[PDB]
């Protein structure tokens, strides 16, 4: 169909509850609509098993493409389910979903070195996360 500088990148935001959709909303209010971001909101329907939810979603993506998952929190059930995919080729797992993180990743998307992209974004994100009473003073 199309061609890519490196691989096609897909993004998954994954959270307990509706955080993932709400953060997508923030992103779209700033950087416009984002077709390659997909959300997983866990335990908003008691019938749905989380392993099936996560495994089914990951299995849908082409193995030749890059999958960048950003979860709500490291210690938690959502992250824990994606840890199995760390040995799947071109799979990238980040924990601690937040806005500066996502903005930096999307603005910097022309970077084809994925490890560079992700670590620079995490770093920029952590710098931006701050106590303003101290940093505006």
Least distance CB 68 / its own copies (angstroms):
10
Least distance CB 126 / its own copies (angstroms):
5
Yes or no: say if 58 and 68 are a contact pair by the CB < 8 Å rule: no
Extract the tokens encoding 92.
């990238």
Footprint of its own copies (CB under 8 A): 15-23, 25-26, 28-30, 43, 72-76, 79, 82-83, 86, 91-101, 103, 118-119, 122, 125-126, 128-134, 136-137
User: Could you please report the per-residue DSSP string of 67-84?
Assistant: EEEEES-TTSHHHHHHGG
Query: End-to-end distance of the chain based on CA atoms, in angstroms?
Result: 53
Q: Which of 3/65 has CB closer to its own copies?
A: 65
What one-character DSSP code corresponds to residue 60?
T
Q: Give the three-class secondary structure for 128.
A: helix
Least distance CB 4 / its own copies (angstroms):
21
Q: Which of 2/86 has CB closer to its own copies?
A: 86
Least distance CB 1 / its own copies (angstroms):
28
Q: How many CB atoms lie within 10 A of CB 113?
A: 10
Q: Which of 3/112 has CB closer to its own copies?
A: 112
Distance CA 124, CA 137 (A): 21
Q: Which of 55/91 has CB closer to its own copies?
A: 91
């Amino acid at each position: 169909n199309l061609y890519f500088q490196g691989m096609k990148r897909h993004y998954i935001f994954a959270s307990h509850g509706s955080f993932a959709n709400g953060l997508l909303n923030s992103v779209e209010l700033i950087l416009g609509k984002q077709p390659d971001i997909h959300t997983l909101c866990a335990y908003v329907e008691e019938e749905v098993d989380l392993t099936q939810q996560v495994e089914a979603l990951v299995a849908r993506f082409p193995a030749q493409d890059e999958l960048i998952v950003i979860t709500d929190i490291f210690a938690g059930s959502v992250n824990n389910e994606f840890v199995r995919f760390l040995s799947r080729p071109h799979f990238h797992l980040l924990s601690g979903l937040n806005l500066p993180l996502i903005i930096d990743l999307l603005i910097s998307a022309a970077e084809d070195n994925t490890e560079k992209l992700i670590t620079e974004a995490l770093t920029n994100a952590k710098e931006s996360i701050q106590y303003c009473n101290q940093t505006i003073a």
